Design a protein around this ligand. Structure first.
Ligand code: HEM
Ligand code: HEM
Lengths: 351, 351
């Protein structure tokens, strides 16, 4: 039994864990580890938005261009591509790139080939929407939790190794306790999403300024290796409730502090689906997310199922990563996207 | 004319500059430039404190040990060594190291050679004080201003080049306007310096937790190369008033939000003085520092002299660097130092 907080990130606490030192969790779970060299990661979501069959091939070709850009020097270490249809009826292709070094990310982003493409007036006449939602949490500002040990997805893939079994899980509040910064910091939101260039209502190029301690969750499901048994457990017994939860956040999240809820399925560059999905959730604060996860019947129903089946699990892969970031480490930019896209929906015009 | 804010760090402003776009400064001044690869610097002040002639040789040797540690793998790019006698009558040797990569800094800090020496029980029995005051401002969170273009000292030494003449200087508020983060952030202090291990009153090992937006100023004077004329201008006409302002901050700074004011002179490892000095000032916020600089007769007197003599200066080198940093990027640690040392003085015991 180990703490989820890596030894180099342990600090004298000025805030207490939810559970006492004697706490033992109910079943094994693991976290991603990295040594002191991992200072900050960059999580970059790049999207292509389109409407209808009419624009499907153009969208895939734009996304091929973006993914190809990841192969340029200082591109991300790892990436994956997803699709979802939003509540406005628009299709959205999203690729996430992970960097383990923010200087490399910035070299890539500022490079002529990348920046000339993104800043070109030509992006405005292509009948597609494009967007960038980028955050750079420090090592202190994220946590991961896996129900398995090998082949860690998402941010875990850019870290060094897997921990042994960790103490801080199996109770509400445990996510927070796994963030090293929770030792001393409440992670409170300040200020608001703010429109700082363009107009969300009118398309074109729009820049949304972020705010400190926006929480971002990627919670994922990978059933690609499951046999008939675990495949059925997932698709028949977990997914229908999860879908209800994701629809709920998508359609009713605004008053709860859920700025954007996407429920996405991995695809390849031909647009064929893979048996892997995840939520991408942007929240005003970690506390808002905590409230929903611990009280909504959808999440509570699947939480119970997990506790019940966790011991049997062989191939079904369930995990999450959650992070917070500083305003100074966030980018939210949109080109010809509809007004409910991502952080456009809740951005404040004149705070 | 150029902006002080480097092109990659310009943002849509939500806070306005103090002067309008048409403003032209009264005389030329320059800043340090670095490209997008410079993400964050680390400024590490490492000290050895002693009292009396009886501890002098032991203190110089302790500092030789510390300076020799900078040659270890992932040591600082640059460093310099200073002496001052504090108001408590203790002598203080301080070496500053600058890193341009925080991962390198952290590899060095956590290395067995460095960390075993710092954490050893042996440190407590040596009749000397040791301290570390380390901060890591992002590129957005510091500014430099030089009255010259070549051989930039301090943090400038780890940056890439010197700018052309810059717009944002010559008025109160210009320091603030030179910080890229001032485009959107008031840089307000939150919370307080807090004792989180040990007891400042009782020596031994003491850890002080920082707070967001502590301001750190290094304002320097180098007359080493001045011929007759500039040597007299400095030592006869500037220094006596500067000394009065430094004594004021040292002895009367607490109510003003100056946590620590040190006026130090460079030395070699033998303790021979060099003709270079600087202030090392730690302030609750940039605003507190602004108020003092723009209103105190000492600083105002030398400000005026500078305006008068700036056109003539050839060899006398005057400059500053000012930074703010996040609580999560600060270290304030003390071993057997007296209770008025650095951040021990104003640290709150039970906030
Ligand atoms: C297959 C789908 C899911 C299942 C079976 C599931 C189940 C669970 C379980 C069992 C835990 C506690 C883990 C532990 O500490 O050992 C947990 C934590 C959590 N889940 Fe889910 N979950 C799923 C999807 C999601 C999604 C899509 C969200 C998005 C909001 C979410 C939000 C959370 C949060 C915020 C926590 C941390 C609670 C805390 O520690 O305070 N979950 N989930
Ligand atoms: C020989 C010593 C010094 C001289 C001749 C001097 C003079 C000046 C001058 C002329 C400026 C305005 C520069 C410009 O914007 O063009 C300035 C700015 C400033 N100085 Fe000094 N100074 C000296 C030392 C110090 C020291 C030791 C401190 C430490 C507190 C200090 C604090 C400041 C601050 C905070 C500003 C920025 C004011 C603002 O832009 O709002 N100075 N100084």
């Amino acid at each position: 039994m180990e703490s989820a907080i890596d030894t180099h990130l342990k600090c004298p606490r000025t805030l207490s864990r939810r559970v006492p030192e004697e706490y033992q969790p109910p079943f094994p779970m693991w976290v991603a580890r990295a040594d002191e060299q991992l200072q900050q990661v960059v999580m970059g979501y790049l999207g292509v938005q389109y409407r209808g069959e009419a624009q499907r091939e153009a969208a895939l070709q734009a996304m091929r261009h973006i993914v190809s850009s990841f192969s340029l020097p200082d591109g991300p270490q790892t990436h994956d591509l997803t699709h979802h249809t939003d509540s406005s009826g628009f299709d959205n292709l999203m690729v996430v790139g992970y960097w383990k070094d923010p200087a490399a990310h910035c070299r890539w982003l500022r490079s002529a080939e990348v920046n000339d493409w993104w800043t070109s007036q030509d992006r405005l006449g292509e009948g597609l929407g494009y967007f960038r939602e980028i955050s750079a949490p420090r090592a202190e500002q994220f946590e991961t939790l896996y129900a398995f040990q090998d082949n860690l997805p998402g941010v875990g893939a850019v870290m060094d190794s897997t921990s042994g079994e960790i103490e801080e899980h199996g109770y509400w509040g445990s996510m927070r306790d796994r963030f090293p910064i929770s030792q001393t910091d409440w992670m409170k939101p300040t200020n608001e999403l703010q429109v700082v260039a363009g107009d969300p209502a009118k398309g074109g190029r729009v820049v949304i300024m972020g705010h400190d301690n926006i929480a971002l969750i990627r919670s994922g499901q990978d059933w690609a290796d499951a046999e008939a048994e675990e495949r059925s457990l997932y698709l028949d017994e977990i997914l229908p409730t999860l879908q209800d939860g994701m629809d709920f956040l998508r359609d009713n999240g605004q008053p709860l502090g859920c700025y954007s809820n996407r429920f996405v399925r991995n695809i390849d560059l031909d647009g064929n689906f893979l048996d892997v999905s995840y939520n991408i959730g942007h929240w005003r604060s970690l506390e808002k997310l905590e409230r929903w996860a611990e009280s909504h019947p959808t999440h509570l129903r699947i939480f119970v199922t997990f506790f019940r089946v966790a011991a049997g699990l062989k191939k079904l892969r369930l995990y999450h990563e959650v992070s917070v970031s500083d305003a100074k480490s966030q980018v939210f930019e949109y080109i010809n996207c509809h007004p409910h896209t991502g952080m456009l929906r809740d951005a404040v015009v004149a705070p």
